[PDB]
Design a protein around this nucleic acid. Structure first.
Length: 213
RNA sequence: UCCCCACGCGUGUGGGGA
């Protein structure tokens, strides 16, 4: 098949841009409207990442789709958007690549049955590693440890626990931006993995594994 | 976080979503 990458530069003057900036559910709904049909028909895995700001630079949202998106669904002036690019990962064994992944390292407690965030850099890096290896990739290892860094570890505001007429607890996920390098071990599998994304929260702008030299 | 589904002789796994 083929893939698509789209760069949205959001207008901080746009109330809708800001609406979606503030709420992943919104952003998800806005984005989802570019690949609606394929979405309905099970032909689409929407994936996106909101890039960390370089200061006065506009917020920038990277989006991957299995199918051709139509951004004419966007209100203007929502975002300066450049024509989507057809994507065709040329993966070969041994090929080394840089990667960026905002994710939610997690496990299900066999004890409680509940899905919980891992707590330590170690556990978080181990998770990312299990996930990459099962996914046809392999972390590169420098002279001291894995060639991988946690650029940020923050909480992502999701939604509020409905409480009777009073504001309840906040629901949020732990979002971990990994950056590093890795090599392809099984091309086709690595492609599956890239087309699917990695771990929970795809609906909130997690799971998008990007790769390039 | 909070929920749902699919599995598990492994101190759990994978998929979706708000």
């Amino acid at each position: 098949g083929a893939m698509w990458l789209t760069k949205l530069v959001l207008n901080p003057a746009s109330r809708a841009a800001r609406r979606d900036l503030a709420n992943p559910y919104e952003m998800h709904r806005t984005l989802s409207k570019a690949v609606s049909r394929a979405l309905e028909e099970g032909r689409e895995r929407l994936l996106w990442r909101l890039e960390p700001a370089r200061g006065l630079e506009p917020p920038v949202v990277l989006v991957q789709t299995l199918t051709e998106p139509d951004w004419s669904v966007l209100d203007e002036g929502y975002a300066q958007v450049f024509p989507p690019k057809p994507f065709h990962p040329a993966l070969k064994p041994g090929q080394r690549l840089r990667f960026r992944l905002r994710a939610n390292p997690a496990k299900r407690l066999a004890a409680t049955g509940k899905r919980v965030a891992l707590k330590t850099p170690a556990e978080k890096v181990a998770w990312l590693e299990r996930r990459l290896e099962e996914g046809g990739f392999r972390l590169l290892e420098g002279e001291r440890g894995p060639w991988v860094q946690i650029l940020q570890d923050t909480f992502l505001e999701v939604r509020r626990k409905k409480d009777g007429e009073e504001a309840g607890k906040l629901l949020q996920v732990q979002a971990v931006l990994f950056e590093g390098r890795l090599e392809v071990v099984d091309p086709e599998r690595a492609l599956a993995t890239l087309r699917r994304g990695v771990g929970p929260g795809k609906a909130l702008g997690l799971g998008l594994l990007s790769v390039a030299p």
